[PDB]
Symmetry: D2
Subunit: 448 residues, 4 copies
């Protein structure tokens, strides 16, 4: 008598389908552990193991026929097993609970998926890293408040993101260690009453460790939230980077031009590249954040142990996964094929940005901050009257404000020398840039 429309809320069949593989693997591992408990005879086990496999192919070969009575995979499969092996299948459920499988199939699917995500994240970071190490010569303005601040290195920039993504990598792996904890063997909420070998289950499914509390493993979705968080953060980084490229791909900036493959245009206006790839990638941040926002609310205030509410997780996990997969691969392709403009980036470097280093001149020579700062104020002052680029002044004009000014001041008016000052660790100095490129190149080894 179950209300038809009521099923419309708990009948995600299409969605369930992609958990079929993991379901079989759990049933199998379980069946094998079952025989070890005598609840199955070597014979039966083989019959069960076999049926499961024929199901796996039916899914792989996409020949598995779905039915109406099918609610979840657990039902779609078991119905199929009995269709093959017969009522001997009823044993496989001995001591087991839908509450166990639901979370077991999910941690599994997730473990694999994250693996694919990670690969792409690393490949995305790597791409940045190499590109940086290539164009270590290119220099362009550093923006603060989206206004020209000081001459910075192009590679320094590319890397800024690369370092922000590698932290995402560090967070992603961490979420993995907690996902790799086998929940199977927790029962409906009290544990397994048949004293099955949970440990045997662990190794069978390659899980790192085993759950600690049944009531917990049954109701907790921390593994879903924690994932969505790392995801959401990752998307923030990726969105900030899109904001930069989109802005830099603007005519007004002309710093760079995305590939046709990752952009849109028109025959009427050839000189017009629309950062389609970047924008979508920027928008997927809210799409992800949204998933996290949801689930967090689903869990809030929920009474202990299993509740039908915990069903909303599946659609959330798949969305983000598929979205991260693509968003990441597309990030790599946008970075790998986008062509820059060395002329534009350097042409964007105006002397006004060097006024700062001028103060560094006096101070390096001994003069206090205030006395070197006001000394530059006067410099740009009379540089306006004359109406000439700050670099083109008088050696006397300098010494007219403050004595300490000498013939060294001539160097202060150079970009490289301006960029080469931050030799310290982290600075945009080419030596620092190489150090970073070495730091990251290393990190990409430990996580392998």
């Amino acid at each position: 008598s179950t209300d038809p429309i009521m099923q419309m809320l708990s009948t995600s069949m299409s969605t369930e389908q992609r958990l079929s593989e993991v379901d079989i693997q759990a049933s199998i591992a379980y069946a094998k552990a079952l025989e070890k408990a005598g609840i199955l005879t070597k014979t039966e086990l083989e019959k069960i193991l076999s049926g499961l496999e024929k199901i796996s192919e039916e899914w792989s070969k996409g020949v598995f026929v779905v039915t109406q009575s099918d609610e979840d995979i657990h039902t779609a499969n078991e119905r199929r097993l009995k269709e093959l092996i017969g009522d001997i299948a009823g044993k496989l459920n001995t001591g087991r609970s839908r509450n166990e499988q639901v979370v077991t199939d999910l941690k599994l699917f997730m473990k694999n998926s994250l693996s694919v995500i990670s690969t792409h994240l690393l490949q995305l970071i790597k791409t940045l890293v190499e590109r940086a190490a290539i164009e270590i010569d290119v220099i362009l303005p550093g923006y603060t408040h989206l206004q020209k601040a000081q001459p910075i290195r192009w590679s320094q920039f590319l890397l800024s993101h690369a370092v922000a993504l590698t932290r995402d990598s560090e967070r992603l792996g961490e979420v993995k260690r907690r996902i790799n904890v086998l929940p199977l063997g927790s029962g409906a909420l009290a544990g397994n009453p048949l004293d099955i070998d949970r440990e045997m289950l662990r190794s069978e499914l390659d899980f790192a460790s085993i759950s600690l509390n049944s009531m917990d493993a049954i109701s907790e979705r921390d593994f879903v939230v924690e994932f969505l968080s790392v995801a959401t953060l990752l998307m923030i980084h990726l969105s900030k980077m899109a904001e930069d490229l989109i802005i830099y791909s603007t005519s007004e900036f002309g710093f760079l031009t995305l590939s046709d493959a990752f952009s849109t245009g028109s025959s009427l206006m050839p000189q017009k590249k629309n950062p389609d790839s970047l924008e979508l990638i920027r928008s997927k941040a809210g799409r992800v954040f949204g998933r996290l926002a949801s689930i967090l609310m689903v869990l809030k205030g929920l009474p202990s142990t299993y509740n039908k509410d915990l069903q909303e997780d599946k659609e959330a996990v798949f969305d983000v996964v598929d979205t991260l997969t693509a968003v990441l691969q597309v990030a790599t392709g946008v970075i790998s094929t986008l062509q820059i403009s060395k002329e534009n980036m350097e042409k964007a470097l105006t002397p006004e940005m060097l006024s700062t280093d001028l103060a560094l001149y006096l101070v390096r020579k001994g003069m206090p901050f205030r006395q070197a700062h006001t000394a530059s104020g006067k410099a740009v002052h009379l540089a306006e009257t004359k109406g000439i680029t700050i670099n083109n002044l008088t050696l006397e004009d300098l010494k007219s404000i403050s004595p300490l000014f000498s013939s060294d001041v001539s160097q202060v008016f150079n970009f490289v020398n301006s960029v080469e000052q931050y030799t310290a660790m982290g600075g945009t100095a080419k030596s620092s840039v190489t150090t970073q490129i070495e730091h990251l190149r290393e990190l990409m080894k430990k996580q392998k």
Copy 2:
């Protein structure tokens, strides 16, 4: 390194299809205006309209076929038309841009959907108000901090939920008006360049008004956001009821029990009844909410005019729309057929809940509030020391704490007389509940539309 994957995001044929009809609706509405502009001859028009009608029917009969080249509906629709009418189809794309179709298709789809949700919503309240009238005599405990507070009427509780939902209906009405504004005619940024008849277009598609500023209309999604807001609140409203009945349906409470069609249970424990329905509904609060937060983020910080980021609204709207629809029907079903334990509700009421009424008894006899609180407080303790319920205290026992306690102090210990004190507007008194039911009936018909 993925161009074809770049195409996997900005693509959604599975979802784009939900807009087949609306899309064709505007192409027809536009074509007609194009002819009125001279861009189309009377004969050219008739053919484009004939083509559009054929694609409309093709989708209807689920006999439409999309190719692996079809990006979105617009692309899959002008492909089939060109395949039916031929090169003549191009004339249609004259002047209008996709930015235009985007907001025109979603606003058209939403209009119809809101109307559905609206009707379903009205069925909940009606179901609620209606039962509130049929069970006006049932009395149970009213809570606070999930602690029994005082005798309240079952109808009162029901009507409180109905009232909160009414405001929902109202908010939806408002969303719908801003939604009933034709954006078609904004071009891709600065408007229609052919001076097309915007009014005639508003007429064909039947819209209340016409988009005020082209830049805005094309780059705005307030209608999406606002709808998701209204939807999220509606859901919180329902999560608060799911929570209420879930608890009231536990054996610990025993106030009511759902029907077999909206619940589940084990074979070995036939007494166990799990309120799945309510669980699902409550949980959708997060689902919907998620969508609201999602879109909100998308818009935040976005530069002026169209931006491919706005393509994330379709799935958000569709999800919430189907969700509210299902949830609202399942909502009505539950409240419609669930069983009430008039016995257990009346059994949960205790004499302790009347301690407040006792104090009040003294306040009507002219005794100051603070003084009556304490007077009722000593009667409680004394009864507690004697190990008996305050209603079993002796008139003498009471007079010892205050001579004012007269023989008529017994009417205080009557759960019916209790609720009967709140006859003021909104109160739980039989009179107040009746008037409330009259109000709602007038609002349900005030809303309607």
Copy 3:
């Protein structure tokens, strides 16, 4: 009682700002109590006088808060009692902190939404006056942050003004549902002494009274609603802020902000930072966070009062103060930002007319695709010769299409380009004038 638990449910810090309305409500109730018999003529007057003195103490800031004061209700009760004695006790008859919490917050909100309203209008009014004066100005129209086509500077401002006006509408609707008196709903079952709520609604100047005591005591739609609206309004100011910033870059050069709403250093005078716009853009998230919090506080909550409900205040107060400042700061930025016509004028280019050209073909009966195909060759050819579309010979045109008469020279005129759009809501001079009037009327109606 615990000292730490009190550090969550005892905040005179924030609660104090409800002192006024709390008094205004206690007075109204006192009055209705007297008419009901609870109070005596001579008592009520003793209560009002004392109640009024408590107002003077707060407005003066002389009011002294005891260490045992938890909520404004206790503080003010305490005072009244020490100011009048026992009599003050009768003031609580048949009332509860529950109905006072909503009545106060709603009163506070009534005025607050008002103050926000007048500011939101001054901003809109401000945006419209500038679209009036600068009606001739023209700059590039953007899509994907790329130059799509010419548009009137006023069409821009108006687009933001038009969306900011939809907010005002929403704001008034929220205000209507807030304008309903919860006072007289008891602890959850309504008023026991049969208080005349009509007199109460009239005394406090509310539009009407609440229908269901339970609903009135436990609902917070007025808080959530106010929050949804505020968020969507900040979003509007966040998209506008974005536009301004990007426009205030040295790259775009479209305009710069007045010194009052920016920051900078004497070393790079030609560099100003839109702190104002940036702060405003960040406040979108500030406010959204507040919406999200309350939404989660209400989720799954069982009927009638629950302490969880006390999180609304701080949320309300924050938004009300945030919108109050943001709106004004925005208004300023807009009426004082210097715009460079020339720069916006130079931003206009030929390529941006290719569309206007294809249209020139269409108007001569030439079909859509054919015209688009023509313009293509028109742009491609001038692209091979090294010249701009507006400089290729008339015979040049004719080679692509014999429909190119000599009036094509009109197409190459930015003003002609905009005037093209006279269809309602377009960018043509008339349309902009029309918009102005409509918005001016909307504001006229919405004055009461």
Copy 4:
């Protein structure tokens, strides 16, 4: 500059908290400044004198709130001159507000996460202890809020303490990524004075040094990350609050809160309102609201510094303050709540042993499907017989399945019930002990922060 704009950044009230952390951030830079050859030993020690003086100003609470200054950076910059003359100015050189801002916060948070880490542990330890003490108490395990099966109250507390452990582990990973000095990264391109950032690290007690100046300035992961951990922690607590709140009801009557963490009335001395747990639950939203807000602030921002990044301090400051208060009230609630061994007992019913009964058959050899069926028969029989599953006699049981022997009586024992689950993680007395030891250990490894 407009004063109104000043009210969107100026907030000494909120800035002040970073006062001391800023002084040390300076003391560190100064020392480094000297070794750079910018400040002479005489200057250094001098400057270091003013700072040490200022850090004592607010410390004891003597510092003067400059009605003209805003951030602490300017307040301290000022007051230093008011002590060490113009020399104080040279304490900036090569530095940047875009440095101290992050440096001052990681330090603050760093000292904060440590304190938070304590309270949390005290909670987990309080749960583990109480569980290990009432290992014998058995009560109903819930699912869909309906009685599912017998379970030990310890197995309950532990599931909460176990989840909390993951919060402690997550908070651990956070604190580490935060322990990376950002100082020496300039306003954008790094420190040009080639200062020794290693000296700074060792000086401020960090662990590592930012790898990219631009990143260290524009990134706010520590803020976001820490916000996410606190939110997941709160959800946990809210879930715990929900249970204990539901259990503290009259209907359930499983436990009662201490007067210290509750609220009541002189009228209803029984009725105990769980204000402590409700306030803890609501904080989930509050906290989540911070996470949400800062996520929207950072989303889409352009590279490097933007004034937008100024909303961090209030979110972090709030969450930190909340986590501290909440955690302590939690530890308080649990350790003082009075449990009803009795009521938890009467809550155990025979019907809840229908499954155990089926399992009995399973072990004896009978396959699952049959055992289940055989069990339902035993249920139906009892029904039509007017008794409970445990009153059916051996012959009654035999008439359903020969397998049922005289040992089947051992099934109708709620203790034996929970003893079936001995597998790793189950609710068997032994399994529970193991858990209690795992956690005592795990807490140790976490205590070594």
